Each structure stands twice: as structure tokens, then as C-alpha cells.
Amino acid sequence: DALLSLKTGKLDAFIYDAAVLNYMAGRDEGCKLVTIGSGKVFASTGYGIAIQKDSGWKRQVDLAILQLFGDGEMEELEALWLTGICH
Amino acid sequence: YDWYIFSIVTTYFPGYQDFVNKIRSTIENSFVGWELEEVLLLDMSLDDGDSKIQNQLKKLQSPIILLYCTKEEATYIFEVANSVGLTGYGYTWIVPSLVAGDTDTVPSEFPTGLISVSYDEWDYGLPARVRDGIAIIT
Amino acid sequence: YDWYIFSIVTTYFPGYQDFVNKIRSTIENSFVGWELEEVLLLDMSLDDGDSKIQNQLKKLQSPIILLYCTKEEATYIFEVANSVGLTGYGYTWIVPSLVAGDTDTVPSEFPTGLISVSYDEWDYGLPARVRDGIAIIT
Amino acid sequence: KIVNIGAVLSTRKHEQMFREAVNQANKRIQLQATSVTHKPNAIQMALSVCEDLISSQVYAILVSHPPTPNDHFTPTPVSYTAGFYRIPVLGLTTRMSIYSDKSIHLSFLRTVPPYSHQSSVWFEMMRVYNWNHIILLVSDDHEGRAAQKRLETLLEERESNKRGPKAEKVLQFDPGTKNVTALLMEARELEARVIILSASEDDAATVYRAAAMLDMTGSGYVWLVGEREISGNALRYAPDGIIGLQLINGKNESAHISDAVGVVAQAVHELLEKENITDPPRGCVGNTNIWKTGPLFKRVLMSSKYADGVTGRVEFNEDGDRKFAQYSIMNLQNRKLVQVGIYNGTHVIPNDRKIIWPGGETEKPRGYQMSTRLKIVTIHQEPFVYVKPTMSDGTCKEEFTVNGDPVKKVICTGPNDTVPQCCYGFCIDLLIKLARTMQFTYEVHLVADGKFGTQERVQNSNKKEWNGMMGELLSGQADMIVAPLTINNERAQYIEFSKPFKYQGLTILVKKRITGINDPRLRNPSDKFIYATVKQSSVDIYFRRQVELSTMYRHMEKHNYESAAEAIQAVRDNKLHAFIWDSAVLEFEASQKCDLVTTGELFFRSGFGIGMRKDSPWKQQVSLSILKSHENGFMEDLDKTWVRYQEC
Incomplete structure (x- = not known):
């Protein structure tokens, strides 16, 4: 709703997650919408899917992250799902 | 159950070539993601030359266990499987209502938490659906 | 044997924490491609509450079987494993010479084709190497 | 049809x-029953066994006949000979597990259970004390070492809420030494007041003596010692407020040996209660082998239990040595024992009057206390830390900002190639955020290695472990250090590190094609194309995990530069095509000097880091601390402080 709004410009700009601005970044019909700035870091942070508080998988899931970075298929799907149309 | 790969079991007892027949048949021409490992059919009359309970037992990677045999023999190889322990938690048990037999009967030698289906003892009443059946004869 | 992944076994009998100790130790700081699943230590004195022969049995994906126990108990859980059949062809058997005991002794309850090492019965003679040993005392 | 023993x-x-x-x-x-004395000569007790017991076809003997000069009474080889017939034997002569071990002595028991469960009863007893951090050391010996082992088994038992059976530190001592003053300095290095040890009473006199010299035996250290250390001549050297313990009714052959008679009876009727119940052959000479039934009789000993004995209800153990004992705790009263009471397996007996802690402590104090100054070490990170030579007095030149703020460089000490210095960097600014959260000072050192640490198998031992100061953090040498480094599974393999809010990057920088590494120009670098990274770097692990690393890591290992600063050298020197470095740090360098054109690729982007080893208040403190760091402008500050410091 706010996306097509900003496409028309129904408001001055559309605020959203830089991730929302990422999937929103690559994929666009025409080239109009751009990041806040070039996309410079605004509230640098990162996301993950947690579990129950103090879950035993804690160190385990940590190792799962070690497989995430230790994967490089992160780059793969980083195309597959995450390749942008803007480029 | 959403198990894409699978496997089954049977005895040499009747329905054997039938259950495998329509089994692989349903597993054959479909566009479904149905898949299955295999099914071990045998006869427990004499002893097991290989003690094949273990042999086919390890061969089973699918949780679902579907066998065809008589409830008593089902206790023979089912308890024999408890000895194998291949029923260990995380598997799944599909049982023939015939192999199941009496709902009131609950042999512990058979796998716990087994699954099946049949004509309804609870939902379907004999006198009611029977009366409607006479009406069908009409 | 060129088995990168592995696994072992032991009883609660002595050398237990020792064999596991130096075991994981050798498996620890090295740059070798050494890898191992686990090792099940227990005590067969009483019964097995879980009949854990099957439990740890399925847990073994490594062909190599390395256990620590007394030859007699080695026959207890080894024959118990034949019952499990988890020794089925394609595995591998590493045995302690102590667990092995007498070379002339060949209990069938133990795994066939087992492997071990010790001081040489064939190559190393008692009187010869013994005489050289006296020369070492000198 | 009658017993002969x-x-x-x-x-x-x-x-x-x-x-x-x-x-x-x-x-x-x-x-x-028929008994002999304690035969003076070793051979005397030996052939003595070969007759008085053997010729009697002796059933069993519960044997303590010491001078009670300790000595771990000699008749180990005796119960051995009982093994030569596989005849039953049960040790009455020791509270050590030395009498336990079956490989040594198969048939045996304890009227004085092995000291193992003793300090373990002190473990669950510390759960009663609800103490957490606990450290341990003792002299070199089998019973001592393996004793500490079994203690860890108790600690290992807890493996499967808040905190838990916290093991502070495991030290060890040699047998028969005077000064522990080094290990005493370790106790100084030990924040926890809990002192776990076991020894004899005189080595314990060295413990309270030199410990008091270290002021370790001084008030403020909770000493859990061994009975042999506790009891005996140590009473002269007894530490103030210290306690000691022993099992209930153990030292009296009246009730204990009487219990040996009673349970012996449970195993007599029981000895007559099995199949093929009989007695082993008599003559030692004339017995060249072990009695098969005698061994089966020992199996009945494994099957031997008693409803209630002279000491009351008692069963066998896993070692078959007694069971369900109760160690009587005695608090100090004016350097004299004020008995707390016996702790059974379930049961525990506190005293009637309030027990005395080592000092005037009313309760078990809080042992673990972190140091204000937490020593740090690193190498200058151009991204943040720029370590300049300090003034001639070691002062730092007061430096305003672009905004004009007189920024504070980080004073430091560093090696000769040792020298003090100061460091201008945003890292120590984040440290100011750290102490700014919970006050923590620090001691800055340098890092000369190829990384924080590089998991590496040395030329000796082939031991693969972090090579660098990271091991020193595993060693905790620097108490709390930091590096702006991305974490790795090796760190995961090493220890839990922090999560920096910084978002780093990894790619190669080139002087100012040049596509990604997979690009055939890069993937197959020509002779004119040379590239590398720092030796023993984290990127060394990165490329060191890859399919094509042969050319990259291997072929580049020839071109590999040891010093990343040197990579900046040959980089600005452009002696090679491009330079693999931290793409973040590359942006920092391209900021100060644009003479190098870094790539635009994206690989391995994580962020900074700080020294984190296992449990630290910096766990949540530093975690949520970072949550504020990015959450506050301190993030945007560093941006201004560093990212905005880029002119070109």
C-alpha cells in the first residue's frame, strides 16, 4: 500500500526496513524508488529465528550459524531468493 | 503423514501379491511425490534362515511401518521386531484392520501407537446403517 | 582403514575412562581427518534397562567397531550383538588384545573377522627377545 | 556343612x-571364625596367607590390622593371592580407593569408603552451601589425581537453571613440596574463595602455612579439604574457621568390624542361598589355579547386600564398598572442631549452633569477582585503533576532533620490536562505552601474531589450535582484549565471542578486470596478477576453506605476505595485482589513502569483536550493551568518528 503510494508519491517518502528496502530494492517495476540515501547503514543490526529462552540448541544453533557463514550457499540463495531486479 | 519416501512389509500370507500389487500400482503411474524404499515379504512358519528380522530391519529407513499378516503372526514378527527394536521411537506403524482384528484386542507384542482404518465401530452403527442397507435392498 | 568418521564402544570395566580418555585425546588436537560418532559405555552386570544393545546399535553408522571389555563379557554383549545383528557384513571390528586374550581362544560369540594387535606370538619369541632383554638388564 | 575361615x-x-x-x-x-595377627614381615603375611587362610579354606576376611600408621596396609598382595584362588576379600584397612581398584585388587570392599564420594559429599554439600565458583588443586599422585577426576565426574554428572555446578579452576600440585607460593599466586589469580584440595595433614600444614603467607589461608577463602588433610597433625596448623569431616562410625572396629560380621552373615546365609554353594579348595600349595566357585562366590559378593547391620542399613556399592555412608561434618570452634554432623546420601546434618566460616563470614561469600583493569592486547586496527608512539614521558598528544573534542588515545604497552605507547582508535572508545556501562578498566598490550589466533597444527605435536593471542585469551593472559575481527567456527570451536554491532566486510583491495575471485581473471590470476593476504590471518582460514583454494591459498601461499601492514606496503607499492584484506578495514585504508582501489565485492561481512571467554558478566552486559551501542548514537558516533573521517 505505502509502496505503490510512494510509487505515486502519496507521501513524501516510504520508510521501511532496509531489508524491506532490500527485497523492495532489487525488485521494482520501473526505476523510481531508491533507498534512504544509497542505502548507508541505518541502525545496523541483523535478524535470526530464535527458539525458547535458553534453549539447549543455543550452542548448537550457534554452530548452525557457523554453518551459515561457513556455507557460502548464503551467497547462493542470496541470489536465488535475494537476487534483486534493480542490480 | 507427508512422508515422501516410504517402505512397507508383508508376509507370504494372502493379500501379499495383492497388497504389493495395488501398492506399487498406486506408487506407479501417479504424479504424486510418493516414494518408497521396499517391502520385505516372507514366511515365519519355519525359522528365519538369516534371522531376516534384523536384515530387513536395518533396511528400513522409513518411519512408516506397513505390514500384511495375521494378528497372531503379527505378534510373532512384531514382538520379534521389539527384539530387533527397529520399532524405536520416531518410526510409524500402519496396520491392516484385518491384521488388527478386534479393536478390543490390544496385543502388546504388536507395535505401540499403530495406525489403521476400517468401517466405523463408533460412528457406524450396525442396526442403523444395516436398516438403511435394507432400504437399499428396497 | 581410511575411515574418516568412526565410533567406538566400551564397558564400565577398567580402562574405560582411559580408553575414551586417550581416545578423544588422540581425536582431539590432531590435524588428521580423524572423526568419530560416539562410544557407548555401560555395565552388563544387571539387565539392560533399555536393552541398549539395540539403542546404541542403531546409533552406530561406522563400520569399525572398537570395544573395551573382558573377553567373557565381550561374548555377552558380542553375542547379544549378533542377536542385534548390528555386526552385519560391511562393519569392522577392532578388538583389544586383552579383550581378545588368548590367540588360541576363538569364541564364536565374538564378532567374526575381528582385528587387534599385540606383542608378537609369531615374530617375537619369548626365549630370544627375553635373552636380549637380559642383555638390556646388563 | 560348616564354614572354615x-x-x-x-x-x-x-x-x-x-x-x-x-x-x-x-x-x-x-x-x-579363625584369625591371625598382622605378620611383621611381608613374606610373613604372605606365607601366613598361604596357610592360616588357605589351609583353612578361608571364607573371607575383613582386614585392617595396621599399626594405624596409615601405610595403606600392606596386604594388597594378600587379597591378590585371594584372587589366585579367586577367593573373597574385602578391604577394611583403607578409606582410599587404592583398596578399591579391581584391576589391582578385584575382591575387596571398604569399611571406610573411598575418599571419592567424600569430597563429592562436599560437592552436593556445596549445593547445600549453594556455592557456585569452585577451584581445586592437590599434590601429584594417583589417588589424588584420580580423586580430582571423580570429583569432575560429579561435575560431569551435572552435564545433562541459573548457574550450576560451577567449576572455577583446576590446578594441581606435585607430591611432597614446601612452597605452593606459585600455586598460591594462582589462588590470588583465583577470584573464587572456594578452596578445594585433598592431602595429608602435614602437607595441609604447608597449605595453611604458605597459604596464610600468601594470605590465602587468611579470611576470605573457603577451604574444602580432605579428611587426611583435615584430620591429624594439621590440627596444630588448622586454618581458622576451617572444617573437617569423616564418615559416621568408621574408625571403630567395634561397630564397623561388627558390621563386617553382620553383612558377612548376610553373605553367609546368602552364601548358602545360591546354586552350587560350597567352599573353595584349601591348600595354597596344591592350588595352582583360582577357584571357579570361589569366583562365583565373589559374584555372590556382587550379589551381597544386607537389610540392616551393626552399623544399620547398608548395601553394596558399584565398587561394592559399603554404601549410603554419612560423613560427619565438624565446624571450627576456637580452632577446635564443633561438629556440624553427618551428611548421608540424602541426609545431611548441620550443627545446632551456627557453624564458623573461615573468617567471620556469616554465609559462604561470593567468590567470583572480576578485576577492574581487564588486560587487553591487539595489533593496531587502522579501522579504529591507531597506536602512535607516545610522548617522551609516555604522554599522548592532546588531539581535538573535526568537531574539536580533545579525543583520548588509548595508552598501551607493546613489545620491543617491550615499550609503552598510546593508541588513537574508536575501539577503545567502545571500551569507554563498556566501562561506561559497567565500570571496567583494562591493560592494553600488543598482538604480533598473524591473527587474534589461528587454529593451527604446529611443527610439533600436530596439535591444531588457535595460533595467536586468541590462545592467550583462552589462556586469559590479557583479561579482556578485543580485535575488530569476524567470528569463525574456530572461535565457536574455541569459545563464545561477543557480537559486534559493526558490520565488516571481506574482499581484496587493489591499487589505484578486477572482478570477483571466481572471475577467470581472478580465478586464474596470470603471472602479472599477484594477490595475497596476511599469514595466519582469519581470511587465511576463509580461503583455507574453499574448493579452489589450491591456486588461491596454495599458489598464493607463495605470494602470501606475513604482515598485513606489509600487505599495505607492497600494496601501495603495487608490487602485486591486488591485496586480500578486510574489506571493511580496506574502506578504512582507502579512506585515509585512496592510492589503492579496493574491489566492490561482498564476502564474509561480520564486524568487530572483543575478548569473550565462556561465562562473563559481559555475556548479557556486553550483549545488550551492544544493543545500546547500535541503539544509541555511539554507533553513529563511530560513523562520524571513523566513517565520516574519510575525505577520499
Whole structure:
């Protein structure tokens, strides 16, 4: 709703997650919408899917992250799902 | 159950070539993601030359266990499987209502938490659906 | 044997924490491609509450079987494993010479084709190497 | 149809009353007892066993006949010979597990259970004390070492809420030394007041003596010692407020040896209660082998239990040595024992009056206390830390900002190639955020290695472990250090590190094609194309995990530069095509000097880091601390402080 709004410009700009601005970044019909700035870091942070508080998988899931970075298929799907149309 | 790969079991007892027949048949021409490992059919009359309970037992990677045999023999190889322990938690048990037999009967030698289906003892009443059946004869 | 992944076994009998100790130790700081699943230590004195022969049995994906126990108990859980059949062809058997005991002794309850090492019965003679040993005392 | 048992007792009354109770319980299908003395010579007790017991076809003997000069009474080889017939034996002569071990002594028991569960009863007893951080050391010895082992088994038992059986530190001592002053300095290095040790009473006198010299035995250290350390001549050297303990009714052959008679009866009727119940052959000479039934009789000993004995209800153990004992705790009262009481397996007996802690402490104090100054070490990170030479007095030049703020460089000490210095960097600014959260000072050192640490197998031992100061953080050498480094599974393999809010990057920088590494120009670098990274770097692990690393890591290992600063050298020198470095740090360098054109690729982007080893208040403190760091402008500050410091 706010996306097509900003496409028309129904408001001055559309605020959203830089991730929302990422999937929103690559994929666009025409080239109009751009990041806040070039996309410079605004509230640098990162996301993950947690579990129950103090879950035993804690160190385990940590190792799962070690497989995430230790994967490089992160780059793969980083195309597959995450390749942008803007480029 | 959403198990894409699978496997089954049977005895040499009747329905054997039938259950495998329509089994692989349903597993054959479909566009479904149905898949299955295999099914071990045998006869427990004499002893097991290989003690094949273990042999086919390890061969089973699918949780679902579907066998065809008589409830008593089902206790023979089912308890024999408890000895194998291949029923260990995380598997799944599909049982023939015939192999199941009496709902009131609950042999512990058979796998716990087994699954099946049949004509309804609870939902379907004999006198009611029977009366409607006479009406069908009409 | 060129088995990168592995696994072992032991009883609660002595050398237990020792064999596991130096075991994981050798498996620890090295740059070798050494890898191992686990090792099940227990005590067969009483019964097995879980009949854990099957439990740890399925847990073994490594062909190599390395256990620590007394030859007699080695026959207890080894024959118990034949019952499990988890020794089925394609595995591998590493045995302690102590667990092995007498070379002339060949209990069938133990795994066939087992492997071990010790001081040489064939190559190393008692009187010869013994005489050289006296020369070492000198 | 009657029992025949020879034995060796300590005194005449032991033998006589032994046969007396032997008659009494023999009625409670009849039995009698026969005992000898403690034979002075080793061979005396030896052939003595070869006859008085053997020739008696002795059933069993519960044997303590010491001078009670400790000594771990000699008749180990005796119960051995009992193994030579596979005949039953049960140790009465030791509270150590030395008498336990079956490989040494198969048939044996303990009227004085092994000291293992003792300090373990002090473990669950510390759960009663609800203490957490606990450290341990003792002299070098089998019983001592393996004792600490079993203690860890108790700690290992807890493996499967808040905190838990916290093991502070494991030290060790050698047998028979005077000054622990080094290990005393370790106790100084130990924040926890809990002191776990076991020794004899005189080595314990060295413990309280040199410990008081270190002021370790001084108030403020909770000493859990061993009975042998606790009891005995240590009473002269007894630490103030210290406690000592022993099992209930152990040292008295009256109730204990009487219990040996009673349970002996449970195993007599029980000895007659199995299949093929009989007695082993008699003559030692004439017995060249072990009795098969005698061994089966020992299996009955494994099957031997008693409803209630002279000491009351007691069963066997895993070692078959007694069971369900109760160690009587005695608090200090004016350097004299004020008994707390016996802790059974379930049961524990506090005193009536309030027990005395080592000092005037009312309760177990809080042991773990972090240091204000937490030593740090690193190498200058151009991204943040720029370590300049300080003034001639070591002062730092007061430096305003672009905004004009007189920024504070980080004073430091560093090696000769040792020298003090100062460091201008945003890292120590984040440290100011750290102490700014919970006050923590620090001691800055340098890092000369190829990384924080690089998991590496050395030329010796082939031991693969972090090579660098990271091991020193595993060693905790620097108490709390930091590096702006991305974490790795090796760190995961090493220890839990922090999560920096910084978002780093990894790619190669080139002087100012040039596509990604997979690009054939890069993937197949020509002779004109040379590239590398720092030796033993984290990127060394990165490329060191890859399919194509042969050319990259291997072929570049020839081109590999040891010093990343040197990579900046040959980089601005453009002696090679491009330079693999931290793409973040590359942006920092391209900021100050644009003479190098870094790539635009994206690989391995994580962020900074700080020294984090296992449990630290910096766990949540530093975690949520970072949550504020990015959450506050301190993030945007560093942006201004560093990212905005880029002119070109």
C-alpha cells in the first residue's frame, strides 16, 4: 500500500526496513524508488529465528550459524531468493 | 503423514501379491511425490534362515511401518521386531484392520501407537446403517 | 582403514575412562581427518534397562567397531550383538588384545573377522627377545 | 556343612570376639571364625596367607590390622593371592580407593569408603552451601589425581537453571613440596574463595602455612579439604574457621568390624542361598589355579547386600564398598572442631549452633569477582585503533576532533620490536562505552601474531589450535582484549565471542578486470596478477576453506605476505595485482589513502569483536550493551568518528 503510494508519491517518502528496502530494492517495476540515501547503514543490526529462552540448541544453533557463514550457499540463495531486479 | 519416501512389509500370507500389487500400482503411474524404499515379504512358519528380522530391519529407513499378516503372526514378527527394536521411537506403524482384528484386542507384542482404518465401530452403527442397507435392498 | 568418521564402544570395566580418555585425546588436537560418532559405555552386570544393545546399535553408522571389555563379557554383549545383528557384513571390528586374550581362544560369540594387535606370538619369541632383554638388564 | 575361615586380625580381642559374633550371627548351616595377627614381615603375611587362610579354606576376611600408621596396609598382595584362588576379600584397612581398584585388587570392599564420594559429599554439600565458583588443586599422585577426576565426574554428572555446578579452576600440585607460593599466586589469580584440595595433614600444614603467607589461608577463602588433610597433625596448623569431616562410625572396629560380621552373615546365609554353594579348595600349595566357585562366590559378593547391620542399613556399592555412608561434618570452634554432623546420601546434618566460616563470614561469600583493569592486547586496527608512539614521558598528544573534542588515545604497552605507547582508535572508545556501562578498566598490550589466533597444527605435536593471542585469551593472559575481527567456527570451536554491532566486510583491495575471485581473471590470476593476504590471518582460514583454494591459498601461499601492514606496503607499492584484506578495514585504508582501489565485492561481512571467554558478566552486559551501542548514537558516533573521517 505505502509502496505503490510512494510509487505515486502519496507521501513524501516510504520508510521501511532496509531489508524491506532490500527485497523492495532489487525488485521494482520501473526505476523510481531508491533507498534512504544509497542505502548507508541505518541502525545496523541483523535478524535470526530464535527458539525458547535458553534453549539447549543455543550452542548448537550457534554452530548452525557457523554453518551459515561457513556455507557460502548464503551467497547462493542470496541470489536465488535475494537476487534483486534493480542490480 | 507427508512422508515422501516410504517402505512397507508383508508376509507370504494372502493379500501379499495383492497388497504389493495395488501398492506399487498406486506408487506407479501417479504424479504424486510418493516414494518408497521396499517391502520385505516372507514366511515365519519355519525359522528365519538369516534371522531376516534384523536384515530387513536395518533396511528400513522409513518411519512408516506397513505390514500384511495375521494378528497372531503379527505378534510373532512384531514382538520379534521389539527384539530387533527397529520399532524405536520416531518410526510409524500402519496396520491392516484385518491384521488388527478386534479393536478390543490390544496385543502388546504388536507395535505401540499403530495406525489403521476400517468401517466405523463408533460412528457406524450396525442396526442403523444395516436398516438403511435394507432400504437399499428396497 | 581410511575411515574418516568412526565410533567406538566400551564397558564400565577398567580402562574405560582411559580408553575414551586417550581416545578423544588422540581425536582431539590432531590435524588428521580423524572423526568419530560416539562410544557407548555401560555395565552388563544387571539387565539392560533399555536393552541398549539395540539403542546404541542403531546409533552406530561406522563400520569399525572398537570395544573395551573382558573377553567373557565381550561374548555377552558380542553375542547379544549378533542377536542385534548390528555386526552385519560391511562393519569392522577392532578388538583389544586383552579383550581378545588368548590367540588360541576363538569364541564364536565374538564378532567374526575381528582385528587387534599385540606383542608378537609369531615374530617375537619369548626365549630370544627375553635373552636380549637380559642383555638390556646388563 | 560348616564354614572354615582363617584370617589375620589386629589384636586378640579381634579374633575372639570375631569368632563370638561369628557364632551369634552364625545362628542368625553354622559358622565359626579363625584369625591371625598382622605378620611383621611381608613374606610373613604372605606365607601366613598361604596357610592360616588357605589351609583353612578361608571364607573371607575383613582386614585392617595396621599399626594405624596409615601405610595403606600392606596386604594388597594378600587379597591378590585371594584372587589366585579367586577367593573373597574385602578391604577394611583403607578409606582410599587404592583398596578399591579391581584391576589391582578385584575382591575387596571398604569399611571406610573411598575418599571419592567424600569430597563429592562436599560437592552436593556445596549445593547445600549453594556455592557456585569452585577451584581445586592437590599434590601429584594417583589417588589424588584420580580423586580430582571423580570429583569432575560429579561435575560431569551435572552435564545433562541459573548457574550450576560451577567449576572455577583446576590446578594441581606435585607430591611432597614446601612452597605452593606459585600455586598460591594462582589462588590470588583465583577470584573464587572456594578452596578445594585433598592431602595429608602435614602437607595441609604447608597449605595453611604458605597459604596464610600468601594470605590465602587468611579470611576470605573457603577451604574444602580432605579428611587426611583435615584430620591429624594439621590440627596444630588448622586454618581458622576451617572444617573437617569423616564418615559416621568408621574408625571403630567395634561397630564397623561388627558390621563386617553382620553383612558377612548376610553373605553367609546368602552364601548358602545360591546354586552350587560350597567352599573353595584349601591348600595354597596344591592350588595352582583360582577357584571357579570361589569366583562365583565373589559374584555372590556382587550379589551381597544386607537389610540392616551393626552399623544399620547398608548395601553394596558399584565398587561394592559399603554404601549410603554419612560423613560427619565438624565446624571450627576456637580452632577446635564443633561438629556440624553427618551428611548421608540424602541426609545431611548441620550443627545446632551456627557453624564458623573461615573468617567471620556469616554465609559462604561470593567468590567470583572480576578485576577492574581487564588486560587487553591487539595489533593496531587502522579501522579504529591507531597506536602512535607516545610522548617522551609516555604522554599522548592532546588531539581535538573535526568537531574539536580533545579525543583520548588509548595508552598501551607493546613489545620491543617491550615499550609503552598510546593508541588513537574508536575501539577503545567502545571500551569507554563498556566501562561506561559497567565500570571496567583494562591493560592494553600488543598482538604480533598473524591473527587474534589461528587454529593451527604446529611443527610439533600436530596439535591444531588457535595460533595467536586468541590462545592467550583462552589462556586469559590479557583479561579482556578485543580485535575488530569476524567470528569463525574456530572461535565457536574455541569459545563464545561477543557480537559486534559493526558490520565488516571481506574482499581484496587493489591499487589505484578486477572482478570477483571466481572471475577467470581472478580465478586464474596470470603471472602479472599477484594477490595475497596476511599469514595466519582469519581470511587465511576463509580461503583455507574453499574448493579452489589450491591456486588461491596454495599458489598464493607463495605470494602470501606475513604482515598485513606489509600487505599495505607492497600494496601501495603495487608490487602485486591486488591485496586480500578486510574489506571493511580496506574502506578504512582507502579512506585515509585512496592510492589503492579496493574491489566492490561482498564476502564474509561480520564486524568487530572483543575478548569473550565462556561465562562473563559481559555475556548479557556486553550483549545488550551492544544493543545500546547500535541503539544509541555511539554507533553513529563511530560513523562520524571513523566513517565520516574519510575525505577520499
